[PDB]
Every structure is written in C-alpha cells, then in structure tokens.
Design an enzyme around this catalytic site. Structure first.
Site, PDB file in Angstrom:
ATOM      1  CG  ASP A 148      -1.208   2.921   7.123  1.00 61.45           C
ATOM      2  OD1 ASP A 148      -1.543   1.797   6.698  1.00 61.45           O
ATOM      3  OD2 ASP A 148      -1.962   3.664   7.782  1.00 61.45           O
TER       4      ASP A 148
ATOM      5  CG  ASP B 149      -2.164   0.863   1.157  1.00 61.88           C
ATOM      6  OD1 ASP B 149      -2.562   1.281   0.052  1.00 61.88           O
ATOM      7  OD2 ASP B 149      -2.662   1.196   2.269  1.00 61.88           O
TER       8      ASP B 149
ATOM      9  NE  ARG C  81      -4.330   5.644   0.968  1.00 64.73           N
ATOM     10  CZ  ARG C  81      -3.853   4.598   0.308  1.00 64.73           C
ATOM     11  NH1 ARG C  81      -3.377   4.741  -0.914  1.00 64.73           N
ATOM     12  NH2 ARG C  81      -3.866   3.411   0.879  1.00 64.73           N
ATOM     13  CG  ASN C  82      -0.565   4.658   3.309  1.00 64.22           C
ATOM     14  OD1 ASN C  82      -1.347   5.179   4.099  1.00 64.22           O
ATOM     15  ND2 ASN C  82      -0.966   3.774   2.407  1.00 64.22           N
TER      16      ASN C  82
END
Ligand SMILES: COc1cc(-c2cnc3nc2NCCCNS(=O)(=O)c2cccc(c2)N3)ccc1F
Length: 272
Positions: free
Chosen positions: A143, A125, A129-130
C-alpha cells in the site's frame, strides 16, 4: 509505467473498496488486481502511487503491471495476491503454520522494507493490513497511498513510533518500530496490538516503558528482536539490514527457534 490499453483488461470480482477488482490481463491471460479512481490532488496522489510502485523492483514489494491513464476511469494494474491482506489471512488461518513459516513471512517483509528504506522511501503506515500474501506465502509491502495522516492528528497511533506521534518525525527507524508491531501481529495470528487500550492509554504505557507482551509459543530470539524494534531511542533500534540478517540466520539454523520466551506476567494474571 507501462500504459495498458483497456481492451487488455477485464474486471471480474470486487476484492476491496474507488474499488479493487480481481481480473485478467491479456497483453496468454494472467490474473491481476485492478484499482479504479476526482480532483487534481486525487489524480496526482493516484498516479503518484503508481509512479512510486513502478520505481521499485523487489520480490517483497507489490509489482505494478501498468496503468490506464489515457482513458477514464483511470486504473492501476498490479499482480494478484491470492491470499489477500496479511491481517485478515492470519485471523482466518489461526494456528495453521509452522514457526519457521511465520518467521519466513517476517523475513520477506523485512527484505521489502530494507529495499524501501535504502531507496529513501519512508512508508509511515507499515501494518499487517498493508501487507499482501501470495500462494507461495510470500509477503509483499502493498500500500503506497499518498494522502495519509495520523489518526487524531488513516495512520493508526498504536502502530506508530513515539517520535512520529510526538513531533512528526517519520523515518525508516519509525518504520522499524512499526515492523516490530507487525512481528507481533504475525506471531499472534493477527491479534490486535494493545487490545482494547485507548490511544492515550497506549501512548502513556509506551512512555512509561511498557511494551506488548510475549506472544504464545514465541521463540525467544523473535521476541528479543521485536523488543529491540521498540527501543525509545531510534539509534538502539536495529536497521532493516540487521533484521534481515538475524531472521536469515534463525531460518538457516531452525533449531534456534525451539527456545521459547516465557509467559508475560500480564498474560498469567488473565488465565484461570
Ligand atoms: C491494483 O492495485 C492494488 C491492488 C492490490 C491488491 C492485490 N491483490 C489483492 N488485493 C489487493 N488489494 C486489496 C486488499 C484487500 N482485500 S482482501 O484482502 O480481501 C483480498 C482478498 C483476496 C485477494 C486479494 C485481496 N488480492 C495491492 C496494491 C494495489 F495498488
């Protein structure tokens, strides 16, 4: 993990939403982030994420301070990353960095990913955003959430490698694909990959040989590197070790970044 007594932790401000808080840790008090929690699966996944984070020690991987597991709600306590999530940060700071700074951010992310890959951890992932950003512009992979599934089976299609979509093969090589997308995010100051193309339009385009167009004022070497991350054949993609090496050389000879890739034809057609 370190077990932290709750009297040592104060939550101050919600920064994400369980929820995430900015707060202070007093084992002389230091800022921290605090995530609060549930089923047995939820507990295993929550403490699982803490256990994974606590197994790592790397500059470009979010640092775990400890957990509250003996009391409820259970909590994870990490370093506090002053600039938050890279995607939002880039979009709020459009145009405000040098090319060298942007490339430096990417090297940091690549170093973190090399470490994970070598530790036999496949992220699945990886996206802006992470990634989180501190007040030294250091980017950290941030994350490690465990209950993740592909969109349209959580994990967005348009960040994912074709083989991970097509036959569920997630490896460090599929993370390299994702890293190529992150490169494009950073060099565009947080543009959304493929804009308004649907998931199925993106997949069809990728399968027909199309890739994301050249970012504005993007160094040729950087575009070449992100294009190699997007080779259909995994064995033609660079390893993170290669990416770190390449980015390091470019940073140490910064004039190398002055040579820019040219305008994509799909960009020309949209300008008046
Ligand atoms: C305690 O557990 C964790 C916390 C973090 C984390 C650390 N640090 C900051 N946020 C975090 N998470 C929320 C990100 C989304 N909000 S944000 O971009 O708006 C934001 C804004 C400002 C600072 C900040 C986040 N800083 C990362 C991993 C963890 F497992």
């Amino acid at each position: 993990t370190t077990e932290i007594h709750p009297s040592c932790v104060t939550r101050q401000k919600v920064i994400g939403a369980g929820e995430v808080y900015k707060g202070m840790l007093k084992t002389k008090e230091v800022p921290v982030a605090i995530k609060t929690l549930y089923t047995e699966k939820q507990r295993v996944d929550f403490l699982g994420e803490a256990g994974i984070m606590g197994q790592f020690s790397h500059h470009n991987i979010i640092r775990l301070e400890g957990v509250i597991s003996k009391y409820k709600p259970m909590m994870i306590i990490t370093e506090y990353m002053e600039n938050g999530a890279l995607d939002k940060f880039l979009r709020e700071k459009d145009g405000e960095f040098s090319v060298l700074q942007l490339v430096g951010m990417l090297r940091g992310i690549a170093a973190g990913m090399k470490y994970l890959a070598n530790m036999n951890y496949v992220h699945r992932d990886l996206a802006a955003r992470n990634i989180l950003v501190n007040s030294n512009l250091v980017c950290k992979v941030s994350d490690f959430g465990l209950s993740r599934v592909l969109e349209d089976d959580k994990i967005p299609i348009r960040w994912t490698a074709p083989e991970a979509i097509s036959y569920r093969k997630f490896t460090s090589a599929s993370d390299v694909w994702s890293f190529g997308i992150v490169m494009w995010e950073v060099m565009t100051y947080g543009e959304r990959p493929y804009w308004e193309l649907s998931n199925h339009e993106v997949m069809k385009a990728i399968n027909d040989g199309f890739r994301l167009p050249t970012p504005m004022d993007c160094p040729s070497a950087i575009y070449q590197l992100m294009m190699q991350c997007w080779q259909q054949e995994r064995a033609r993609r660079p390893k993170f070790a290669d990416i770190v090496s390449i980015l390091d050389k470019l940073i140490r000879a910064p004039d190398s970044l002055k040579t820019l890739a040219d305008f994509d034809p799909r960009v020309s057609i949209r300008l008046p």
